[PDB]
Design a protein around this nucleic acid. Sequence first.
DNA 1: TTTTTTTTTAAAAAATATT
DNA 2: ATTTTTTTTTAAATATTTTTTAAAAAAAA
DNA 3: TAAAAAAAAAT
Lengths: 351, 254, 253, 253
Amino acid sequence: GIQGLAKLIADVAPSAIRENDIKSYFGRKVAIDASMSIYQFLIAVRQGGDVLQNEEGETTSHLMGMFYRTIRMMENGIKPVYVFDGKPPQLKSGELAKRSERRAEAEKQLQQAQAAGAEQEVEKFTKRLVKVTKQHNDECKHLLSLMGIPYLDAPSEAEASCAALVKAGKVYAAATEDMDCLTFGSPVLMRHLTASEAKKLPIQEFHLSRILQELGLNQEQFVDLCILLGSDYCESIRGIGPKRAVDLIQKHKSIEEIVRRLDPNKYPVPENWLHKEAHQLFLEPEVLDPESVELKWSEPNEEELIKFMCGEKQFSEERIRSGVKRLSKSRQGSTQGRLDDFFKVTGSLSS
Amino acid sequence: MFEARLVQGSILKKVLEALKDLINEACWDISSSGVNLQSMDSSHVSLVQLTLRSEGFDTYRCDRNLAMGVNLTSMSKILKCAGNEDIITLRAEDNADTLALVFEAPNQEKVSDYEMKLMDLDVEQLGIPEQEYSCVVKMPSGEFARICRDLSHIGDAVVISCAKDGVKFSASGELGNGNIKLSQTSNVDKEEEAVTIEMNEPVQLTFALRYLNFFTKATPLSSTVTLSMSADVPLVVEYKIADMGHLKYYLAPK
Amino acid sequence: FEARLVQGSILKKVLEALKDLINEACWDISSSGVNLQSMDSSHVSLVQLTLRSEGFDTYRCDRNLAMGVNLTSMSKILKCAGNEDIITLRAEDNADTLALVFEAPNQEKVSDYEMKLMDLDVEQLGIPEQEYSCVVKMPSGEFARICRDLSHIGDAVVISCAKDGVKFSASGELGNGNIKLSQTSNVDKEEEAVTIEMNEPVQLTFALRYLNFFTKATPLSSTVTLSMSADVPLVVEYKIADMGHLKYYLAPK
Amino acid sequence: FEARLVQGSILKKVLEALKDLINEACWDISSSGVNLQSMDSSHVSLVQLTLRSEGFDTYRCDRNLAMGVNLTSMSKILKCAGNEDIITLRAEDNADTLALVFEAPNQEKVSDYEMKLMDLDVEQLGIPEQEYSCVVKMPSGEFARICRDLSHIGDAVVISCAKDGVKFSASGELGNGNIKLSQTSNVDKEEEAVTIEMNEPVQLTFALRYLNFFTKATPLSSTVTLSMSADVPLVVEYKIADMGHLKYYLAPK
DNA sequence: TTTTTTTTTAAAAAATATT
DNA sequence: ATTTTTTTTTAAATATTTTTTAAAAAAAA
DNA sequence: TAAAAAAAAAT
């Protein structure tokens, strides 16, 4: 979670963010973080604050939300690779300590607010108490196995796996709300890949190659720039935000030139500030091999998925039947070929 | 520095009525040799290659190369403020942030100046190789618009096959199937109706139909669609604009 | 089954007339010709469509097959034909697909259209021996005008038969609306001729929604042959010149 | 009350003019003629209808009634009329019924339409008579074309009058319209007859959505009369041919 | 042939079930 | 008076349905 | 995992 990166690319390079809709991708393999979608559909999809409690005692909210997201994402021709989250390294343990004390504050404030009877703040601070579990990802990967969409499990982090999937050319893009994929290495990053999307919050297709050309720096210096923005692995220098890190990176390329020309009485270097290992973790992370894995969009079993969602996930028969029929007519037709495959760009045009 | 007096500006109105349903923002590649627009769809499927040469404009005096980023639905709403007889005069000022469009009526009683706003766009210009096509089909434009409008009711994709007898516009969908055959004719008295097919090999391709229905808004320009095909090269849907040039619509197959 | 039709605009106007009132219909294809006694999407109005084999150019049929088709999809396929296109129906013996060949008038643009079919079958209801009391042969553009006028007032038209003419009384939210017709002095065949026969007086209340659906067969024939009696449903007949007739049945309210 | 128009297309075009902005109107008829001074639901613009008794073919009124007519519904009843019907307005002096009898001059269809009229005691706002600065007289198709032109620009038109001619101009977020006409002194009497009655340079801002509802009255006359000055509201006069006039009032922005 | 109109679909509003 | 960063807080859909704005398409003047 | 907004030293 790089603080102030998307705003930096928005106010520096609006040409690099090729803003478009969900109609603009035909047959593009898109490797998506699963855990971002699972938290989005455990937080946004609510029964008034009851997160879709079924008749057996489980949570069917996230399966509902990302099932219909995946059906409308095959309706637009986008081929998803739901890359699941991995076991986080030792550098993200401080960020999960921050998340654990944030959950502790939210739990204490939820127990304060449930006595007060302010039921909207009760809903807010049970929406801030959403935790991913092993059974949530296990039943979600079971749903991916049932509906024929391929999935991957990351060894370390899903953003690194998505970025090396773009880097190997296996997929076209990553679809994360997280901005770490521009530093784990993905040249093309879409954001806000939702199903119900016409004009309300459309796709921010970030381009790492475009911003490295227009600010004039390679991957390692952009990794260092997002260290000084402040990532979720190691801390940043206090007093340096977007514009100061952009100016100091563009005037001083290496991280040693950032460090040694700084007085400690105005810009302190923090204690145990591990920039080298976070640099090596953005350049070479623990990633599963993208050439070794295979991405196959198989035909789903229809009535078995219907009896699964209507026997122990408590859905409607006609709703799941309509969804599997929608994906079946999505996979029936031929793919729509693009025009940049056949014609090559000579040069852009100004105004 | 750019002035383009067009007496027959009805076909300019037809160009911008054809353009607004497909692309919303484009840049005119205005040069001294003519006016061009090579802009691509937002879904990155279809290209519009436009050419209005300087011979068709009756007073063209543009000095240097000018690229003008324009909202084409706004430009078409400006050009809907002229009738079918007015002399649409393109005019651009120094450091042109406005496009002055003078709609002089030919009876010299109504002069409609429309200086309309622009935008900053960075659009790419693709490289089109000038290479010969396998199946060059020259049908009427109204019949092609009719064919695309009928086949859009069945399914979203024609499967167009050229053959020895003629071009076949096969399409299928949830309403069933539809095949439209067009024999090559030469015995008609009108040269617009004569479906001329330049055969090299019989080739079968599949094209989307929303883009083809977007292409067939250019049918009031002239009654000549030059469908040009190859094995995997995109379809050229070429409209002869009357004595300026072409409205070559490109379409990547399926 | 091969039913060639030179005037395919007749079949296109039949499908335009029947697309808004029957969505799924059975097509009782006999050797005598194309026949249809389907009924509407509601349970109010009956449609008796007859297309005899005399108006068809080459009619061939082997067995009395009934095709349950979707009239909306068939009307969208009949919209693909031109207004002068020669339409050749074709049905295979074993395959349940209706092939339509919209041949060009100059026989250039051959338009083969295969249609998928469903298997909806309904019970058949024939003509229940109408006495034909008041037969009002009046122009179809005027009946379409009268129903389009009185649909803007209310959902009740009151039609009264008389010797001097026929009334069309409608009342509702806007107010009273009457439309009175008369005879015609000079003997004119199709247009501007309201000819009425008279056996017993009749005064019935009909809905304007189903009559507005009925008036979509106006480009088929120029004359509406109204026919009604006491407690007998109104027969809006649309006799086509070259073959058959299109009968619209409507129970009074 | 018995008012008869030998050509009722004038009355139908008056109701298609007035149905778009006046929803409820009072028809203050008199023995001198049919008058209306109603004002719209947006309460921004006054409409003056003058229908002289000399233009009526058979006019008769003695009580000088003050009926209040729902105007969209009675425009629907004029939409029930044909374009050449001899329209006979009628109203009995004891009942609140506006009877309308539509008679075709050759065709035998005589249609009677009564109405329910609500009670409307709405006061009159009589405009004074004054000399106007620009009394420009331009064609109605030209003014409809100019208002539909500049309505794509924005909701504001500035109208300038000078020696060369009237100059309509609109500005908005899409562009900047500027329609400059010219004084026409031709003798051949073509489609354009723009005459200037030039007195004093004026420049006033008017809404264009409202002016689109104003120029919905286009097929009443070939020519309009925009009579206006610097502070008074704009007067758009639709001079009906020897039948009366429809004056339209719009306050400037 | 083009108007304007009238009508019929294809985008947003706008909560409710989704459970 | 900016310029810039860093503190708190606020958030994270989907579909079906009905009900609406906007754009067309026949079917006539 | 995102953003806006405001407080507050840097500017």
